[model samples]
Target: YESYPYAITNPYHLSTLATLFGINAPEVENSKILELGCAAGGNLIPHAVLYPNAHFVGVDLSKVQIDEANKNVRALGLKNIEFHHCSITDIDDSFGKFDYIICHGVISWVPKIVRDKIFKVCNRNLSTNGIAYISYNTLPGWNMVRTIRDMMLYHSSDRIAQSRLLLEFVKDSLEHSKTPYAEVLKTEAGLLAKQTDHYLRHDHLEEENAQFYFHEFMNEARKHNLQYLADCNISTMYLGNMPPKVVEQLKAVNDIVRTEQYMDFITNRRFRTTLLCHNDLKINRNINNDDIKKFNIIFNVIPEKPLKEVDLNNATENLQFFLNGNKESNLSTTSPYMKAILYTFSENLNNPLSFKQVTSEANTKLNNTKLNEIKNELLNNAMKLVLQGYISITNQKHRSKPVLDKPKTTQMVIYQAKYTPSMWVTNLKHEPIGVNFFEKFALRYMDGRNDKKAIIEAILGHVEKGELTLSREGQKIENKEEIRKELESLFTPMIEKFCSNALLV
Candidate 1:
């Protein structure tokens, strides 16, 4: 949008969804994952670290974008990822195969010919079971928005002023006119706000976004031997948890296309980010034991069914989640609290422990008031981990201790001061600056009393408590000023030691 010749997704979003789809982690000794039209490789670097066994190779047409991506990745010392400068249309078979392919905010923003070529490249480079994610400004609802945009485009003549000016224009015009469409926008505040976000989003969108059609998408998928699986927001494909009467009212109509159109109209789902799967892959249809293993590889497809049908508490929880329109289920297979807890354990595991050892550690590590709550949280998380195939609870009585193969992380010294007594050692690429690992390490050891590994262990101390102090959405640094203070504490000595004339650059 800022003339970054191409695009890339946020890696947090990319990996979360990719794992759900069952993509085989890239095999390249830190295998390389490719993102086409990678404007900044925003989605690649972090994700490459998340799946430490793989690498990320992001290609973009914009030199500026590639440069920025390279700087960020280097500053972070993310050795598992790389950035490339290239256009999707120009990419050849020489680019090599990818374990995963991601193209977001790209297809709908580019030209038809380019899109055709993108499919060709995806087909050529995608490995078996590799997924290709495409996001688009889809139909029906877009029809209204597009109509409004055309009118606005004509009226303003200046694309820059179109968003604010046009919506006000629509509101003011509707105030006087008697149109059936005016009522829809007038009544829905959520819809109105989303519409605003959309127009601005479109303004910043690449030129090719305007060249999409539903049938064209389906046709393109055929060329690549891919089939549309479901919307990235899977709930969008299902009927909402409405009153039966209301569901019937909306769904009573015949016609597949019409039902979808009406569904979009009713829900105001204007945009679509659809998931396409290799046609040869079998999905949720037959979840056999082998399929269960495959499902666990990509997604934490935990067990939701009760061991006995009469276990109403579990059923009620599942029902309530569904009734809330499956909003949480769309992103996670476990409860949000459980997801957060397990994520905490996986990232913070410095010691190998059995199930009981993990739970006991959580209880003692957390504060006394929260100890009981932490225990329950750990137990629930462990249960879900078994259900999701992420881990197993062994029943074998052994004289030996049970072992867990904890998820791997990339540990490195991202920065060093030649003249100073300081270095920045990061245990994971996605871990935040001055928070989570770094801040805890600094507070514990930067006192000049402890060793580097000891400081890391102190950070590990907090991690063992079971509640991670970070966002589920990755390291966006919500409290920038506070984080800046933490950074000063951690890096000030290194800065002083490295240079006499000191002002942080």
Candidate 2:
């Protein structure tokens, strides 16, 4: 996409995820990265902006996309990244080694020769410890969706709108039907009902799309001197969300590859973002509690009630806590061990604390208890919390900020707000945030120099110039005083939300 692309394929996220299974994925800082099918540098440009020291090379078959990417690179005055208009087959041994290679949305949508060549490129170009992220459509799931694809292909392969209309018609036809096949088609149609034009064109209408089994792709990878490390999102590897019996059956399956295949079958999973490394690399397939120590913990817990100065060691009360501000996903605990870590992590909002740092803080907060006392328990429980989705683990620490007046974000964000019409702004953490009209307008002005009052004036000025419409309480505000008062009250919280959304540097 020329405007925005998938954010999960970000290198920072993958490198941090690789640490979970004991793969020392190269740090994104000063690392060399290459992106296959990097359309107009939508994915790579953000990385280039975030990691100025890193070198990024993007190869795409589209001359139009490459031209636009280079144009934007020049417009942004970025020097660390560049795009090349070339086929995947053009990448060879001389392509040089990259610390991280990303091929998202390309494998499943290419021919066998291209797919084989892709593995070849990874084998040839990837460094000793480098990690490659290759995402694909998988089997048992795509087998069902293929039914819909076959009909659409037969009905209209040349016209996207007509093809989408045919799928919608088929979905309408199956409205009263009752069967697994019928329901699956109906569900697939439902998912595609409102997809963007680009998504519909490439994902649903592409004739070259392919699907693979987890083991099958790895088989090709092994043939090319590559091996399976883990999925980029390793949380999906766990059976925590499955039925107890299903989890047990998966555990009995034993082998990692087979378990993943079984998981695809069980969940009807259609897609995967897998991580690969050089075959001879020694991988710790089994993760121990101490492995948790390598990661910096990210968490923010909302306690059910305010314990402003309560004793964390002796308060022994079973405090209810919401993780990442999600009330539905909660942790109820009485042990000071849980409270200690939770309170310490919560206090260190936006700035992730290292495992050792967390242990020290929690232990000292627990009435000067020995560091060794709950160190093991803390490590174990912290990982357990991560598994439960109550907290998270990451190695990359990007710029973050607390709620502050006269809020400021980066030039990259301001650039996205002003130029990217797609409105998919990749934040400081490389997470995609869709911005509305006001958010984009407000973001451009959040340059740290202007106070909230100045921001209010700017908004009202836009209204005066007919560039913005000021609305409040279900009515348009025509009076200048009412508009000013409303903006004054709203701008304060808007800055807080901007900070919370990781818009602030």
Candidate 3:
């Protein structure tokens, strides 16, 4: 049965896909993207709007879905994308090269001819760095579903009747039977019904369908000259470090390929969005738990919650120990480079410190060489810490919510020291040194649209001593030249991160 175009509005799936692709959004302008089983343009439409720069093309075998998708495109005024009603076999390489190809739920429901055509077209039309998304119901995980399907295949003729009658038989049989099979089947039937309706709406209403084993799926991709990448949803693959015993048992074998196959066996990741890259593309030589962990760290990085929300005066052991435990922020093993990142966190505690005061304190803690290295290292790590949710940098002076970049474009929004506290800091111990007596101001001018010089100026603004401040009076921009530079630098890093992460969800 053909269907109207629908919205596949699963935030989790979209965001997870973004993480899998290592991008938060489609960033390239004038780039081409294709969707093999576009359906009603369910998932692709939103992508088109969010990434206006890319040119989107969707192909569907159903004319009904095509008509509905066109309506959505017109209603949304998404000029960047177009849709067509055509089978995969009809697709020609000249249709144009694409950076991304998405096929959400077309596999397993269609004929082998259609599937082969999909792979052929993907291999031929995909660009040099392209990624093709194919989601499917996997083997082993579908064993229970297959049992239900087997029963329904005998009882019903189509998806609608099978869903209805099989659900009743499964439900009734469970109500009377005492075996575990009855309860399990009952639960399965309920789930199957809920999902069957969902599937039917997406237009999968036939008993004659094609399903696959994982290795076979990968082999098919290889046949089309594509290499299997990672699953779109990584959490299914990570398994959270695994148990010690499990790890030991799993590692006994020297064959690394066996490890992946074994992990799949353990997880039973039946439903998956597998990405495929052309054979010519250099796939990362290795992807293991370590790589997944690193990606997780980046994926889950979050800025510290607002400082104002927590009472700084009522410091707990964790906070005190965190600060006093190491006066040197760069000393922590968390950051690869060792430097004085702690002072940056300290100043954000709403207290102010003069450039001289902070510098003197830094000098007393380290030798000249170490101090110089510490400063740059601390700066670099502090930015990462902020991104990773460990800490936040805010304005001590302004009663406004400080964003990453606000004032001039391209300015690094380091927290500028602000408050003039009584001695800046007063601990029960001997009045703490210069570092304790400082605060920070959020750099206001670092919009992604600004130039590098403008960003440096903003970062240096807070730390500049008496005469050095006057020389580069960045706030005194008088012409379009300065404004243009500021805009480029302001938005650079933020936009770069946005693109790199793709943050789709």
Candidate 4:
């Protein structure tokens, strides 16, 4: 199976959530992180590069993947990390304690013994207040998807090529079926059809695919002195998806297990990346203004209108918002502070800001002092906004200011541009950047020495060799000087893109 890392499993992200939940999580820059199924060090290596003081350990059952990870570590000249070709069960007291234990893409496909062993390992090796990021296919939601898996596995012993063919057949056959399951199955088929064959073989089509309800997973977790902290995205855990009436009715069910189960069924959540902590710790799930204070906020949502066109002080009017210009995470808030907060976040986009910075900015924008309780008001509203998938609050509160004069990317990006086997690369913020060939080429020359002129000169050499081409207006531009000019024009825009993408140092 092809291996990849998940961004949600990042220790910085985990610690932010742990801090929000009132757990004193280990520091990201000075902590030990363990990944059970580390694939080629895609996820953990970036952190190791960014955090030289922190130690990272990855153990995977596959010799090939583990060897690849070790080779990549050596290639990158990365110290403070180890890739062990061993089973998850092989991790013991000798491995010592981890501040964060990541088991992404492993739990659902493993045997029953291995599944339980995961929690056992977490309980044994995890620090008293450390967080474990474990991802799996969940129940009720997986019920429909499992049907597709069942049909595929039952019919095709030799999977991969047959899986796509079966999915296409099922999609066409069930396209107009009247039953909701049939319609849902059709939708599932369309979704799975887009996934890589590796995901199909290693995940959905695995022989020992296990499904569990949230409560059931917790039951097993509790057996091993581990408890659910929250999903990686806390917004999904909120009742923000429900209408007021449904939320009002849900008030009777107060337990997190029951509430989360209801939320799972409400959204038909197929998969989850969850955080677990030692059950002995008293977790403060009731998030407040103080909790909001520690996190710097970023938003995935965009306003229907640009910030320049919108009035931040207009409290009486409701503003519309959307996510990535495609879907609706429609925020119709009349609160000026909320509007200003959203505006501030939209200015930075993926960049984050402290609670005081936003609130103080909101106050500055609106020029209001009579607006008492704005902090609490904004806190509640922000969490609700988060539930709509609009906002991301993280301890990753700082941005790397790229030196535009002579732009240089981080060592992680430098390594990724030159050596990463996959198109996906991690930026300084620990976020994934889907890098391209051109970006990769440019990234290599982004050292302090190579300004735009020198970088373009390097690319011009490639253009002359026909190794690369300069295309303009859907046709290749062959003029040497013209291509040089085009390359000059591209340098700033490309560098700016990398700057915003957190690629620069």
TM-score winner between 3 and 4, please give it. Answer: 4
> lDDT tens digits, residues 1-505, model 2?
5556465677776777777766787878889999998978877887888788999999999999899999888888898998889999998777799999999888998989999999998878998888898999998778766766677667763467787788789788887787887886787877866665665564545575667988898889889999788776666777767779877876776677888887788878888988888988887766666767777877877777655655556656688778658678777777777677777766666566787788888888777665776686686676666665556678866344444667787767888877767666777666677776667778777786877777666766667775566678765776776677777777766776666666787
Clashes of each: 17, 0, 48, 0
Task: Report lDDT (CA) for all predictions.
Answer: 0.49, 0.77, 0.51, 0.77
Tens digits of per-residue lDDT for model 4, 1-505: 5455567777988898888788989878899899898867788888888788999998888888888888888987888999998888777899899889999878988888898899998989999878999999898888877777788887685568888888899878876879987877787788889987766763446565578888888888899988888899776777735688887777766687878888888788888888999989898877654556677887655677887787766777798766664664466677777777666665565667777766776666666672455666677777665545566788875564466877888887777776655676677666777865667777867788887778877767766775566665556686765577777777777876786677777
The best candidate in terms of TM-score: 4
Query: What is candidate 1's lDDT per residue for 1-505, written digit by digit as tens?
Result: 3212111233332333444444433333344567877756545554654566776787888899899778767776677778778778767788787656777777876777888887886678877756567787776556665565565456654454455666665677678556766776554422544553444545543232454555567677788787665455544655545678866876676433445555666666567776566778754422223222222111112233322332222323432212112345532333423333343343222222344444444444333244455556555444344334344222111122211121111222223111112323222222222323443334333432444445445544554462334333455334443344444454545333211111111
Off by over 4 Å in 2: 151-186, 202-206, 240-255, 300-318, 323-327, 343-350, 356-377, 387-390, 398-403
Instruction: Mark the regions of model 4 whose C-alpha exceeds 4 Å error after superposition.
Output: 154-159, 174-179, 202-206, 243-250, 301-322, 325-339, 361-380, 473-475
Cα RMSD, model 1? 12.5
The alpha-carbon deviation from the true structure for residue 286 of candidate 1, after best TM-score superposition, in angstroms, is 5.0
- lDDT ranking of the models: 4, 2, 3, 1
TM-score of each: 0.53, 0.87, 0.54, 0.89
TM-score of 1: 0.53
Pairwise lDDT winner, candidates 3 and 4: 4
Q: Write the residue-wise lDDT of candidate 3 on 1-505 in tens digits.
A: 3232222222223333444344332334455778877767655665566557778888888888889879867866778999989888888967987767777777777788988888887788877666677888876677777666666655654457655866886687567778887887788788777763655432333355556677778778788888766665444445326888877776676543346567767766467677777776544433322222222111112223233343322323123214322343322232212322343324323223332333444444443445555445544454344333343222111122234443321111111123222222111111222222111122233343444455455544543442112112454554344544544554465433322222101
Model 4 pairs whose backbones collide: none
lDDT of 3: 0.51
